[PDB]
């Protein structure tokens, strides 16, 4: 199969507050699971200068302190998220995401400008590497049973859909990755700390990105919820 696009419109959404938006996700492939009948399906904010927060998933299960102006709805490959009164402090980029099949995928996003009228991933700071050099990034969780989890990477450049690195298995520290990253990333954990590692390899101004690490579970938590701080990488 090849990889599930998600096409989001519209690309951006100018609005006053007391406004109400919505703003569509498509996919290339269902992501209704004939199995259980459930959308493999989330919607992720990322506010200004903040990483991104987990508001819906399974198309339409909103995380628990979501505020209720938040509705996502649809099936198969149409899928919907409504704010029926949106206030200054929805301006964000507003990303569908598919965790149906790997590798994961996010859509372009949609953003949202606004005119008046206990879970922590604790990352590494900010690194300039030169090019053909390597560099480990640390993400150390608290506020939750360490093994119980995977830690996924996402990389994120100015202008562009999110793209999914991989994940690894924080019980059997054993990872999957994405196609295009393969060579380029390698995940470790360490139990006894709580920490996740990604080592980035002969790296280049391609490279050059945000990484956030990102904590997803099993079966209500499958899809990706709590997001590390993120992890600024410059090669020169």
């Known amino acids: 199969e090849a990889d599930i696009v998600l096409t989001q419109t519209p690309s951006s959404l100018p609005v006053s507050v007391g406004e109400k938006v919505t703003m569509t996700c498509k996919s290339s492939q269902t992501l209704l699971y004939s199995n259980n009948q459930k959308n493999y399906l989330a919607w992720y904010q990322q506010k200004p200068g903040q990483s991104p927060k987990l508001l819906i998933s399974?198309?339409?299960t909103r995380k628990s302190g979501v505020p209720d102006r938040f509705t996502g709805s649809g099936s198969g490959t149409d899928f919907t998220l409504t704010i029926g009164s949106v206030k200054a402090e929805d301006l964000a980029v507003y990303y569908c995401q598919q965790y149906s099949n790997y590798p994961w995928t996010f859509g372009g996003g949609t953003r949202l400008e606004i005119k008046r009228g206990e879970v922590q991933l604790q990352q590494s700071g900010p690194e300039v590497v030169k090019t053909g050099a390597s560099v480990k990034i640390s993400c150390k969780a608290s506020?939750?049973?360490?093994?119980?989890?995977?830690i996924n990477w996402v990389k994120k450049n100015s202008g562009k859909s999110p793209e999914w690195i991989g994940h690894?298995?924080?019980?059997?520290?054993?990872?999957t990755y994405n196609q295009k990253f393969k060579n380029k990333a390698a995940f470790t954990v360490d139990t006894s700390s709580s920490t996740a590692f990604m080592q980035l390899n002969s790296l280049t101004s391609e490279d050059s990105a945000d990484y956030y690490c990102?904590?997803?579970?099993?079966?209500?938590?499958?899809?990706?919820?709590?997001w590390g701080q993120g992890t600024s990488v410059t090669v020169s």
């Open positions: 690894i298995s924080s019980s059997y520290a054993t990872s």
């Open positions: 399974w198309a339409f």
């Open positions: 506020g939750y049973s360490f093994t119980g989890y995977f």
């Open positions: 990102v904590r997803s579970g099993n079966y209500e938590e499958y899809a990706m919820d709590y």
